[PDB]
Amino acid sequence: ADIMQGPSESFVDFANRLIKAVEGSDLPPSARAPVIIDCFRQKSQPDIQQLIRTAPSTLTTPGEIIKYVLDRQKTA
Amino acid sequence: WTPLEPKLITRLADTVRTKGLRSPITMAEVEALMSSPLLPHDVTNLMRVILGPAPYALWMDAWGVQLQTVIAAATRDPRHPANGQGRGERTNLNRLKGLADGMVGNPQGQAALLRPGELVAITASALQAFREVARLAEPWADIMQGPSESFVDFANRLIKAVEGSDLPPSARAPVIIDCFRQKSQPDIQQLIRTAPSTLTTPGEIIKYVLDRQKTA
Amino acid sequence: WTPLEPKLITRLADTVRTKGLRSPITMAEVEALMSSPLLPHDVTNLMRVILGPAPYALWMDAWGVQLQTVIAAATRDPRHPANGQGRGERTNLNRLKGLADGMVGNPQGQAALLRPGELVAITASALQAFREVARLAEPWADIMQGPSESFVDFANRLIKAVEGSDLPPSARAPVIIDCFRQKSQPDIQQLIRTAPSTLTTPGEIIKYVLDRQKTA
Amino acid sequence: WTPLEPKLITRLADTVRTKGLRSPITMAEVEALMSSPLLPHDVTNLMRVILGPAPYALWMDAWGVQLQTVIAAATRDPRHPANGQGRGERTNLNRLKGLADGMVGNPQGQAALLRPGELVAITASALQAFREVARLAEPWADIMQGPSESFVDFANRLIKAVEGSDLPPSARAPVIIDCFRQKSQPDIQQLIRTAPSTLTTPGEIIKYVLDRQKTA
């Protein structure tokens, strides 16, 4: 719950770090995917936050969110 | 047909006006006025009076969607308390929304032709739609205990934001505990860390912290 | 005949005095006190007490016009619940307005000679007349979303002004949509413009905007 | 095959250059040079010459889309004047866009294999695509009658912007009327308001206002 995407960090590194810390924690197995999704939505600095918010489709899996963000990310 | 008291409706409208749509007291009051099975006329006028124009539009949409899900389940099971055994008792959405023949604008005829199963299904649908619109109209991982904030205020805010969120019901307690441990500025963090007993419930953590907190 | 409580009438009069004629709470209260079929005496005295002099004149006019439309429909169909089968039961406006023989000023005789269909027709006519006068007493193309206003308030105001206007019923939804798109200050304008799906209903636009709105 | 005169094409290009794409004189000139059924080569070169690069790209897109709609209607009806009775005469988009075998770059062979129905369908498609691109390249609820502007100019501008917009066809007349009533600065507003007759058509409103307008 203390993991933020740094201003200069890429998104795949942030996703790796977050999934690592969530799966290697004390949560039940059935609570990891919703937590990872809701942490993608609230962390992951406001450009990607708005990118996920304005998703014409409903993303219901961390893999789908990662794919969508990697497709439509701001190349920089 | 007997109408609901305008006094109760006025009190409920003022409750919605002061407390909002999402307060637990407001939902309790709505559950109270949603006790007896209401006719489509009753629920429609009730939501017209207690809700503003835009929430009323949202609620009409949500009520239609929930009634459509109900009718899909009804065509998926001929034993619906709204349905009958033969095909001539199948319930159309015109009969649920009060749009069928002999019902449009007339609550007496409505009460005549409607089934009790129809009434309870309409009522449950309207309640779920109200819940959806209330959750829609007006972030737990961003909540920190301020440097000057007390611990009971922080716990109240955190439990509110966690229970009023999109998490499953079985994932709220572990999240509340792990947010008590990682938020709640490092004095209380160390106070929880050095707990000779194992705290496995938000209430127990709150009690322990309130006992051993630094009076200041 | 049993009169309405002066306590309820006093509360309704104060409601009309503070909230106005057009508030949804006021219309709900009027619908409440318009539950049982009232005799012309009851509705006339009720409007005399709750309405001021000029709104009362307007309401008398509108009630007469609506009752005349009802009597035209009645002479257009001999199966009116106010009419009878033979020509001797045809209902004249003197019997509807309470001006017929044996009714002028006497509520007991009124309740004696009147039909239940007559009562419900009079009541519906009076309700529609009240709605007309309320819409008349105290512009949709001039509505803009203020810089600080939320979107649900703007949608409520716009839908209210569009539905309570002179447009045909089949032209309200396209106008509401095209006003959502061109009003609703450029942040929401761009939010609606860049919609990967096609939004073809005010409810769908409202849901989409409420989902993807900039929390602030 | 006979080519179009480069003199007419030069005059049309200068017309498009000075008047623009959307002027009624330009559309009339295009309709003039779109009189005889043209081969894909002719229309393609014509749009290459009269349109700039970006409008030409837009026009290629729109022409393709309209031709695809035509081919969908053609597979939805075997009696298309471009089709034949058997399946061997079905018209592919390569034959419409001039991309089929024996046609690529050769206008003589094009004119040989093409049908007159094919030619007229291609021509109508190209005209509709030109209209779309012209409407796209260079807001009706923002139109006001200026303090010094005459009423026929305001009516022309308003009807243009309303008919060339995203409204359904059945919603243009009520919108034009209600915009005449609320725009069109308060002298004409009061002139329309105090109309002893009920005006239920934009033409009737225009005639009435032109009759009773304040000569100045």
Residue numbers in the entry:
A (entry chain A): 154 to 229
B (entry chain C), C (entry chain B), D (entry chain B): 11 to 148, 152 to 229
Paper text:
As the virus buds from the cell, the viral protease cleaves Gag into several fragments, including the capsid protein (CA) that then assembles into the mature capsid shell (core), rendering the virus particle infectious. In mature lattices, CANTD interactions form only intra-hexamer and intra-pentamer interfaces, while CACTD interactions are also involved in formation of inter-hexamer and inter-pentamer interfaces. Our results show that, like lentiviruses, RSV is sensitive to IP6 in vitro and in cells, where in the mature CA lattice IP6 binds in a pore formed in the center of the CANTD hexamer.
As the structure of the tube-like hexamer with C2 symmetry was already solved at high resolution from regular tubes, it was not further characterized. In contrast, the structures of the other two-symmetric hexamers highlight the structurally dominant influence of the pentamer, where it actively defines the conformation of its adjacent hexamers. This observation was further confirmed via the structure determination of a small set of T = 3 icosahedral particles solved by single-particle cryo-EM. In T = 3 icosahedrons each hexamer is surrounded by three pentamers, which causes the described threefold-symmetric distortion of the CA hexamer.
